[PDB]
Design a protein around this ligand. Structure first.
Ligand SMILES: Cc1cc2c(cc1C)N(C[C@H](O)[C@H](O)[C@H](O)COP(=O)(O)OP(=O)(O)OC[C@H]1O[C@@H](n3cnc4c(N)ncnc43)[C@H](O)[C@@H]1O)c1[nH]c(=O)[nH]c(=O)c1N2
Length: 452
């Protein structure tokens, strides 16, 4: 067959893949990006389309303008199980036309020198001499089966992880996803009969009965258009998520017009720490495939762009030394952990706590205000549950007369602090990965026992 040689091969054109191609362009590298979907359908994976504005500023990513921005978000309303307590969290964000913005990032990168092939599926990985040296692509637009050699393969195939799962199991980069370390989510976009009250505010509904292990959401894309859905923890035995959706839709969205359904669908969402290593010999993994999603609120489009940013930095550093080994691309792990990875690991522990709280615990926790707004987003933006804040919350929990998991809040905050420092002390060399990984597991396996 035909053989082509590129510097970098990016597999997947979503938020992770496109951001990687954007940050890498115009810097002396021959780059190729592929995606199984047609160009007009790239990035149409079922999503809440809600991304913080801060992610666009930090990474130097272009703001979503025009049709790419459906609605401006100024805050989030958090609802208690009994609907009696409603917390208000402020912060600027964007309700996106995800495919429209994702395609502009691609098009701009294409104008900067990056070659893009749509309707192209990475089938077989090229693994020779213990290194990832490219992939066998199938462009069904031209019905060609091309063999593309590359120094570094960027894996951004989404949650499906279709490429890196075909690599040898001896590679640490082939770490799989445990069923309980992920959530299944489903969403629909409908038009509303009445105008949406506070359409600049996202609504998030907490309920372990209507959405066990996750939550319901109500994301206005306009004055009369809303993204409504839910998410539940997988590997627990729960019935189909569509049953939960169909049963409790009217409770969280009675104003929707069910005859004006625009889109519908769902997908798997990783809710854990990132891959222990997101880079190995001739390969970097980013996005859902590298488990980049915030374990608490399930937002992984912002962190995907972060992983792509760190992928670009690591690759440029690799070519700067002529080293495409794991030790050469190791800045990918260092960059991402400091940027978002260390936060994930901490929230990974906090997630396991929140998923095991009853509705009575959540109702009590919100009404009695165990934590204020000043400390809440301080936890979901930095991953830090300060020991001073945990003490102030425990003094409130001490006024509870019934047995509850809430009484272990201080122990949780200490475990989060421990695993936080453990991730900030990420192994400098791949030779220390094995030892560090087993230490992390010991923290997690111990914490899982402490919740019983
Ligand atoms: C229902 C629901 C709701 C939400 C969310 C998820 C879900 C399922 N998320 C998470 C968010 O959708 C997700 O984490 C990001 O899109 C991750 O970006 P990726 O590009 O890695 O994924 P994505 O899945 O978009 O990337 C995969 C891409 O690669 C392509 N591909 C796959 N295999 C391939 C192969 N072998 N060869 C070539 N191409 C291949 C696919 O076709 C696709 O285009 C979210 N996030 C957030 O921050 N805010 C939110 O509000 C939500 N809400």
């Amino acid at each position: 067959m035909k053989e082509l040689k590129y510097d970098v091969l990016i597999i997947g054109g979503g938020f992770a893949g496109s951001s990687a191609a954007y940050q890498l362009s115009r810097r002396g590298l021959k780059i190729l990006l592929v995606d199984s979907k047609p160009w007009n359908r790239i990035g149409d994976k079922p999503c809440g389309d809600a991304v913080s504005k801060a992610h666009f500023d930090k990474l130097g990513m272009p703001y979503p303008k025009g049709e790419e921005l459906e609605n401006k978000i100024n805050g989030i309303k958090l609802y208690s199980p009994d609907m009696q307590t409603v917390w208000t969290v402020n912060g600027e964000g964007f309700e996106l036309n995800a495919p429209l913005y994702n395609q502009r990032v691609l098009k701009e990168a294409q104008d900067r020198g990056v070659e893009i092939w749509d309707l192209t599926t990475a089938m077989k990985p090229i693994f020779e001499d213990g290194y990832v040296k490219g992939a066998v692509l199938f462009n069904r637009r031209t019905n060609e089966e091309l063999t593309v050699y590359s120094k570094v393969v960027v894996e951004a195939t989404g949650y499906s992880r279709s490429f890196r799962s075909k690599l040898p199991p001896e590679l640490p980069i082939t770490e799989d996803l445990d069923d309980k370390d992920a959530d299944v989510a489903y969403r629909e976009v409908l038009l509303t009969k009445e105008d949406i009250e506070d359409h600049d505010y996202l609504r998030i509904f907490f309920d372990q009965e209507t959405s066990p292990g996750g939550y319901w959401w109500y994301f206005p894309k306009g004055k009369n258009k809303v993204n409504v859905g839910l998410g539940i923890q997988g590997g627990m035995g729960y019935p189909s998520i569509h049953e939960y959706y169909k049963k409790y839709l009217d409770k969280y969205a009675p104003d929707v017009d069910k005859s004006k359904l625009l889109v519908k669908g769902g997908a798997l969402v990783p809710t854990r720490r990132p891959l222990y290593t997101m880079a190995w010999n001739g390969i970097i993994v980013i996005g859902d495939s590298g488990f980049t999603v915030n374990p608490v609120h399930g937002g992984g489009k912002g962190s995907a762009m972060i992983s792509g940013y760190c992928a670009a930095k690591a690759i440029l550093s690799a070519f700067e030394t002529g080293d495409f080994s794991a030790s050469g691309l190791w800045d990918m792990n260092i960059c991402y952990v400091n940027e978002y990875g260390a936060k994930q690991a901490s929230l990974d522990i906090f997630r396991r706590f929140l998923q095991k709280l009853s509705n009575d615990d959540i109702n009590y926790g919100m009404k009695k205000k165990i934590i204020k707004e000043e400390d809440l987003l301080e936890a979901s933006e930095k991953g830090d549950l300060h020991l001073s804040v945990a003490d102030k919350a425990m003094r409130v929990i001490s006024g509870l007369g019934r047995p509850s998991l809430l009484f272990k809040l201080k122990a949780v905050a200490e475990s989060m602090k421990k695993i936080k420092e453990l991730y900030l002390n990420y192994p400098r060399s791949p030779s220390s990965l094995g030892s560090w990984r087993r230490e992390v597991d010991n923290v997690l396996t111990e914490f899982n026992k402490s919740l019983s």
